[PDB]
């Protein structure tokens, strides 16, 4: 069964039987607050093989190991994320070891594995084999290093230079990190490590038969993995191809550029002549005045908004390359009508990703009537304001403080292209802390 639109499981293990038929989940999975801790090994779900979104486990107080639950869970595509993370394993007060031993790709997000009171087998498993960008992982606060004694049997197991180590790699005391040899190159492999079709992701029931894949590194259609969707078939929910018989009969839809989608994007609109016609603006809403931005999850809510009729805050503590995504969501924003603020955004080097931002109307301001404000941005070397590109502030003051790597000449050049000298003191745009350590 292709379950969905998304599974939130809480209160008791006895509700968990809802999974007994699912094999793909077109949505997140939550497992929450199972405080009874008792039923434990009464449940199994071998049908499950791909989760198209994040997996969250929180305080599942009874559970020793997820390999009792999800032995075959092979791909977590991460088409939605949870605060950059595609997998979260948090306060599992009794969890000893992960299991998941068949897991073979995580196709977008990072990992946050944290506070787990008894979790052995952390990082004795090469996250760079299973996913790119290990530097976005955040494994913290767990059972401290020397206490475990992580092992494989006989340790006599599959090995690598675990980072700058060289070691056996071990999901749990019973199982190696089942691995496909380098002879496969980019390919995955079947059991007996024979390299499979280059559209398979993770394991495969027989070598190099396109039907044989478990999961598809691009799209699934009619029981075969394929690098792109067939003619007249539309990409849907980031992993499968469909036709109007589905997309018309999703509950309240449109079709566009071979995507099946909840609304037409910027530059296209409903033509009522037939409801398929996204004929060639897009407005984000408000509810808080302050639509804070902190992660790809909160930024994904803006995906393709043209007019943002609120006030931003930006707060990006960490994330090696997140601007590459923020351009994809937010670079279409031409207008912010409120104020704008930036705070503690130690990950940003540049606003460059704000690709098409034109205006800041200052319909709403900070205390002190600041319509723009920039504080404590310990790495923001550059503004997007290269003179090729305009930025018009239609009312109110600017402010700038403690931007240590941002040359004052740069913010002055912004003062030039915004033409906005006659609104600030020495302090509001000071040399005395902005850029004070800029190289």
């Amino acid at each position: 069964e292709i379950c969905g639109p998304g599974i939130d499981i809480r209160n008791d293990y006895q509700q968990l039987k809802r999974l007994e038929n699912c094999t793909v989940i077109e949505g997140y999975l939550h497992i929450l607050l199972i405080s009874k801790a008792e039923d434990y090994r009464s449940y199994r779900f071998p049908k499950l093989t791909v989760i198209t979104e994040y997996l969250l486990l929180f305080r599942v107080a009874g559970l020793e190991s997820l390999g009792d639950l999800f032995p075959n869970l092979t791909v977590i595509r991460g088409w939605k994320l949870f605060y950059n993370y595609a997998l979260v394993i948090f306060e599992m007060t009794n969890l000893k070891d992960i299991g998941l031993y068949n897991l073979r790709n995580i196709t977008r997000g990072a990992i946050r594995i944290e506070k787990n009171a008894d979790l052995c087998y952390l990082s004795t498993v090469d996250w760079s084999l299973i996913l790119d960008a290990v530097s976005n992982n955040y494994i913290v606060g767990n059972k401290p290093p020397k206490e475990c004694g992580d092992l494989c049997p006989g340790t006599m197991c599959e090995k690598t230079t675990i980072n700058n180590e060289y070691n056996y790699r071990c999901w749990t005391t019973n199982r190696c990190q089942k691995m496909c040899p380098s002879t496969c190159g980019k390919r995955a492999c079947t059991e007996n490590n024979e390299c499979c079709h280059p559209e398979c992701l993770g394991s495969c029931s027989a070598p190099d038969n396109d039907t044989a894949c478990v999961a598809c590194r691009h799209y699934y259609y009619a029981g075969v993995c394929v690098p792109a969707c067939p003619p007249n078939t539309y990409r849907f929910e980031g992993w499968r191809c469909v036709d109007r018989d589905f997309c018309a009969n999703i509950l309240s839809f449109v079709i566009h550029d071979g995507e099946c989608m909840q609304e037409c994007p910027s530059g296209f609109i409903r033509n009522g002549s037939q409801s398929m016609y996204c004929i060639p603006p897009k407005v984000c809403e408000e509810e808080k005045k302050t639509k804070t931005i902190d992660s790809v999850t909160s930024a994904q809510m803006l995906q393709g908004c043209t007019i943002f009729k609120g006030n931003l805050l930006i707060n990006i503590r960490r994330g090696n390359n997140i601007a590459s995504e923020l351009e994809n969501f937010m670079g279409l924003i031409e207008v912010v009508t409120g104020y704008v603020k930036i705070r503690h955004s130690h990950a940003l080097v540049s606003l460059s990703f704000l690709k098409n931002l034109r205006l800041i109307l200052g319909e709403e301001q900070l205390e002190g009537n600041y319509s723009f404000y920039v504080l404590d941005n310990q790495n923001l070397q550059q503004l997007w304001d290269w003179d090729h590109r305009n930025l018009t502030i239609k009312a109110g003051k600017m402010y700038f403080a403690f931007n240590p790597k941002l040359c004052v000449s740069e913010i002055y050049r912004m003062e030039e292209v915004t033409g906005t000298k006659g609104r600030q003191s020495k302090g509001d745009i000071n040399t005395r802390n902005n850029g004070e350590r800029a190289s």
Binding site: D12, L32, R59
Partner: protein, 54 residues
């Protein structure tokens, strides 16, 4: 108690909801955080049954 925020928030919630269990429904839904309602602002210890099933 003026404010509650961390582990003791999920503990006091489990205590008040007890064995009735928590409510959840898809965001379909409002963007207002319980934490702003009970850690930053002064919290109300009689409200937190409103999160439990009934």
């Amino acid at each position: 108690s003026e404010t509650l925020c961390g582990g003791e928030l999920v503990d006091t919630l489990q205590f008040v909801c007890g064995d009735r269990g928590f409510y959840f429904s898809r965001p379909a839904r409002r963007s207002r955080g319980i934490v702003e309602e009970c850690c930053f602002r002064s919290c109300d210890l009689a409200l937190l049954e409103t999160y439990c099933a009934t």
